Each structure stands twice: as structure tokens, then as C-alpha cells.
Amino acid sequence: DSYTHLSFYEKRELFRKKLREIEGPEVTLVNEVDDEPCPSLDFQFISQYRLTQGVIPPDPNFQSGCNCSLGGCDLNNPSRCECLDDLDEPTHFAYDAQGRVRADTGAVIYECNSFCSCSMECPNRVVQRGRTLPLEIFKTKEKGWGVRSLRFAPAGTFITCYLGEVITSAEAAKRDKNYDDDGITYLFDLDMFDDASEYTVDAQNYGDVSRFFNHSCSPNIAIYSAVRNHGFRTIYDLAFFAIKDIQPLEELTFDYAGANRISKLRRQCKCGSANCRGWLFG
Ligand SMILES: C[S@+](CC[C@H](N)C(=O)[O-])C[C@H]1O[C@@H](n2cnc3c(N)ncnc32)[C@H](O)[C@@H]1O
Ligand SMILES: [Zn+2]
Ligand SMILES: [Zn+2]
Ligand SMILES: [Zn+2]
Ligand SMILES: [Zn+2]
């Protein structure tokens, strides 16, 4: 398997080159557990969803904007901003003066759009401003590859989005037939507002840093469904935030359950939590 023709120092050095080619905060690779040089070299880091055949993209004709106070929306005037039309009073932006998701924010974040009259510095464009923390892909003890932040991250800090190939329910069926006995899957259902378009995000071939997030039964980050196209919601952003205070070099983990050979891989859980459920889905 793999590319057994380049040796350790070359394979690893090609991955570091692959990370340095990512725009934004630095992403690193370290391994002090064993001798594996890096994750797969056929993986591609993307800054935006990778659509496929059969997927109806988000139609911009259903997309609206706001007025607000040409520059930056005012955090203390949530009723004026048309982007917050949804949800029940008291209407408030999902973010506080510190740019972190409020503790009373729900599972749905409503951000501004390209239609809005903001200068991109709007406080309601957190996700769209991408990753802000420098991350590190490291090798774990009993799991495969993991991720950990290098700087302290308060509760509510945005980490990054979960990206990958957006595929249809049919497409996912024929990929399952390829997963071997010990295959590793990277799926994430996109089902929170509709169930007709049963789309899914697969990170096996294309994805973001978040592909390496490990499961934990007592996680420290959660998924907030961020929405820009307020019309069609068959596709939306999967935005990770901190639900606890996270210290440097602390492993980032979430719960693989916020709502065929896949469900017959599972494997055993090893998050070291006193409240561990004992099982896992790849
Ligand atoms: C989306 S993740 C991929 C991250 C994985 N660490 C890697 O090498 O890329 C799913 C896989 O990660 C491993 N994994 C993640 N969390 C685990 C956990 N608590 N316990 C055991 N294995 C875990 C499992 O092999 C699982 O199939
Ligand atoms: Zn705005
Ligand atoms: Zn606005
Ligand atoms: Zn807006
Ligand atoms: Zn566990």
C-alpha cells in the first residue's frame, strides 16, 4: 500500500511542504510516538467545499443581505440587521464583543453574505474569516493521527470548518463497498434542516485540517451549524467551536454523534474518559 518508494525523510518532507502551502495560520506535523512519516500523500487540503455530480449547489438567487451600520454591523443593534430575521427574541448576533460564540447561542449561527453591505471585517463573519489558531497534526498513542492547538483557546473560540467532498446518498453507497475490514471513514451527515437531499461530507480524498479530529465521549469542541444562504439550507457550514477552555498542546476532539460496511468497522474507543461509552464509529 501507499507510496513505498520515497523513504522516510522524503515522504515526511513532502507533507510539511503540503502544509506550508496552506494559507492562513501555520499548520505543523510532528511524530514522537513511532516512525510513520505522515498521513496519506494523496490527500488534498481545500479551503472550500468540493462539490460532485448530482449535488444541487446553493442557489445565490435565494440569498439576501442586510444594510446595518457600509463597514461593520453593530453588535448592539441585532434587530436592524436583516440576517438575524430568523430565530426568536431577543434577537442577538451569535458572537460577543470578543468574537467568540456566546454561551447562550443555539446550534445555528446566521452570518452575513456577499450580498450584505459589510467590509468583511463585520463581527458576524467569524467562520468566513477561517482558522485563526496555529494547529499541529501529531501522532497519538492509541489512535491514528490527531490535532492539538498551540495556543490557549477560550470556550467559544472558533477553530475551523469541516470540509470535504459533498456527495449524494447514492455516491456514498458505492464508496462503502471499497472500505476494507480496517478501513477509516471520514463521513459527516449534512442533515439538520431537510432530509430530502441526503447529502454528506466525505473527507477521505479532499478535506480540511479537521479531518484528523479524534472522537471523545467527553469532548472539548462542538459543531455549530453556520448558515450564509438563508434560503436553501441543504448545504451549510460545519463550524467547530470550543465548548470548554482548551490549553496549549491539548488534543482537540469532538463527539461523533451530534444528532453497509461503515457501521461494521466501528473499532473500540480509547478517549480515557471516566464516562466513555466504550465503542466508536470510524
Ligand atoms: C475521522 S477519524 C480519523 C483520524 C485518525 N486518527 C487518523 O489516523 O486519521 C476516524 C478514525 O480515527 C480513529 N479514532 C479516532 N478517535 C478514536 C478514539 N477515541 N478511539 C479509538 N480510535 C479513534 C479511529 O481509527 C477512527 O476510525
Ligand atoms: Zn455584517
Ligand atoms: Zn448586518
Ligand atoms: Zn448581514
Ligand atoms: Zn470514549
UniProtKB/Swiss-Prot annotation:
It comes from the Eukaryota. Zn(2+) 3 binds at residues 73, 112, 118, 122. Its EC number is 2.1.1.355, 2.1.1.366, 2.1.1.367. Autocatalytic methylation of specific lysine residues in an internal loop (autoregulatory loop) promote a conformational switch that enhances the H3K9me activity of clr4. S-adenosyl-L-methionine binds at residues 143-145, 186, 211-215, 269-270. The keyword S-adenosyl-L-methionine applies. It catalyses: L-lysyl(9)-[histone H3] + 3 S-adenosyl-L-methionine = N(6),N(6),N(6)-trimethyl-L-lysyl(9)-[histone H3] + 3 S-adenosyl-L-homocysteine + 3 H(+); N(6)-methyl-L-lysyl(9)-[histone H3] + S-adenosyl-L-methionine = N(6),N(6)-dimethyl-L-lysyl(9)-[histone H3] + S-adenosyl-L-homocysteine + H(+); N(6),N(6)-dimethyl-L-lysyl(9)-[histone H3] + S-adenosyl-L-methionine = N(6),N(6),N(6)-trimethyl-L-lysyl(9)-[histone H3] + S-adenosyl-L-homocysteine + H(+); L-lysyl-[protein] + S-adenosyl-L-methionine = N(6)-methyl-L-lysyl-[protein] + S-adenosyl-L-homocysteine + H(+). Residues 64-130 form the Pre-SET domain. One of its GO terms (cellular component) is pericentric heterochromatin. Zn(2+) 1 binds at residues 66, 68, 73, 81. It is an enzyme of class 2 (transferase). Residues 133-257 form the SET domain. Keywords: Chromatin regulator, Chromosome, Cytoplasm, Cytoskeleton, Metal-binding, Methylation, Methyltransferase, Nucleus, S-adenosyl-L-methionine, Transferase, Zinc. The keyword rRNA-binding does not apply. Histone methyltransferase which contributes to the establishment of heterochromatin by specifically methylating histone H3 to form H3K9me. Part of the Clr4 methyltransferase complex (ClrC). ClrC preferentially ubiquitylates H3K14 and ClrC-mediated H3 ubiquitination promotes clr4 methyltransferase activity. Clr4 functions as a reader and writer of H3K9 methylation. It sets the H3K9me mark and afterwards this H3K9me mark is recognized by the chromodomains of clr4 and swi6/HP1, which then recruit additional clr4 leading to the methylation of neighboring nucleosomes. Component of the Clr4 methyltransferase complex (ClrC) composed of at least clr4, rik1, pcu4, rbx1, raf1 and raf2. The cullin pcu4, rik1, raf1, raf2 and the ring-box protein rbx1 are components of an E3 ubiquitin ligase, whose activity is essential for heterochromatin assembly. Interacts directly with pcu4. Interacts with mlo3. Belongs to the class V-like SAM-binding methyltransferase superfamily. Histone-lysine methyltransferase family. Suvar3-9 subfamily. The chromodomain serves to recognize and bind to H3K9me. In the pre-SET domain, Cys residues bind 3 zinc ions that are arranged in a triangular cluster; some of these Cys residues contribute to the binding of two zinc ions within the cluster. This is Histone-lysine N-methyltransferase, H3 lysine-9 specific. It comes from Schizosaccharomyces pombe (strain 972 / ATCC 24843). The chain holds residues 195 to 490 of 490 of the full protein.
